[PDB]
């Protein structure tokens, strides 16, 4: 049980790196 | 059963973020 | 135990990357 | 089984991720 | 077993980019 909420907040913070990425790569773009 | 799910979903997260980065490489380059 | 502990190594390392990153795109956003 | 299969996609995901970032950071001096 | 050294070498590997990160981070803070 443990290991599944480590993993989920691995999860989420993964998701907010994917959103940063994002936004520099519309940044980048323009 | 749990465990897997979060995992294929931060394999997924991890996918995309590579994508990303790719494209950001692609720009930066030329 | 061993593996929780790792995860929890993994996560706060992901925790700096995703600071780093939101400081990255403040730069480029300015 | 499965979860170390999963894991050693996430292993070589992210190896490819760090390799395009080694790029990045080279670009970006130059 | 085996999954304990998967994560320790996903480990290894997030260390490196967040050393990466935090170069280019001061690239593009300089």
Do not use: M
Request: aromatic share 4%; no cysteine; glycine share 6%.
């Amino acid at each position: 049980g443990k290991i599944e909420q480590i993993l989920q907040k691995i999860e989420k913070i993964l998701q907010k790196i994917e959103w940063i990425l994002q936004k520099i790569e519309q940044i980048l773009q323009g």
